[PDB]
């Protein structure tokens, strides 16, 4: 499904993402916006290394979830990558929390560095009542 901005903001807050490991809600919103445009069914195949990015946060199969076709991969979130394509984002959120628990934190997503880091991200949550 494709979330509307404020709808997603309220959903993430309820799931406990605001300030999770120091990452503000607006940063997670900026990340979801640039990664998938708030689309839970988005997938991106990386022909260069044979891995695929899944869901709203575009989580990669080489380390985070299992899709069976990615070479030399692990599954740190202990999930089938299919779980990251559901309309209900509970599992995608639990896995995103795992990703940021790693030593790079939010920086793990290159898109965050490119479009969110050191920018005014307030706009992503304004008017949402969060």
- What residues make contact with Na ion under the rule CB under 5 A? 61, 66, 73, 75
Q: What are phi and psi for residue 23, nearest 5 degrees?
A: -95, 115
102 is catalytic: no
Of the two residues 25 and 95, which places its CB atom closer to Na ion in the complex?
A: 95
DSSP 107: G
3-state helix, strand, coil in the chain (%, to 5): 40, 10, 50
How many other β-carbons are positioned within 10 Å of the β-carbon of residue 27? 22
Give the active site residue among 4, 7, 18, 35: 35
Q: How far apart are CA 3 and CA 8, in angstroms?
A: 6
Of the two residues 46 and 117, which places its CB atom closer to Na ion in the complex?
A: 46
How many other β-carbons are positioned within 10 Å of the β-carbon of residue 96? 29
53 is catalytic: yes
Q: How far apart are CA 123 and CA 130, in angstroms?
A: 12
Of the two residues 63 and 124, which places its CB atom closer to Na ion in the complex?
A: 63
Give the active site residue among 4, 7, 18, 53: 53
Of the two residues 19 and 45, which places its CB atom closer to Na ion in the complex?
A: 45
- The residues annotated as belonging to the active site are 35, 53
């Amino acid at each position: 499904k494709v979330f509307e901005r404020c709808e997603l903001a309220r959903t993430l807050k309820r799931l406990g993402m605001d300030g999770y490991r120091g990452v503000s809600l607006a940063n997670w919103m900026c990340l979801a916006k640039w990664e998938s445009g708030y689309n839970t069914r988005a997938t991106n195949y990386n022909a260069g290394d044979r891995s695929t990015d899944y869901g709203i946060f575009q989580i990669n199969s080489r380390y985070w979830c299992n899709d069976g076709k990615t070479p030399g991969a692990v599954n740190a979130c202990h999930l089938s990558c299919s779980a990251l394509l559901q309309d209900n984002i509970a599992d995608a959120v639990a896995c995103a929390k795992r990703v940021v628990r790693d030593p790079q934190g939010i920086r793990a997503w290159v898109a965050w560095r490119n479009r969110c880091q050191n920018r005014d991200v307030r706009q992503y949550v304004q008017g949402c009542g969060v």
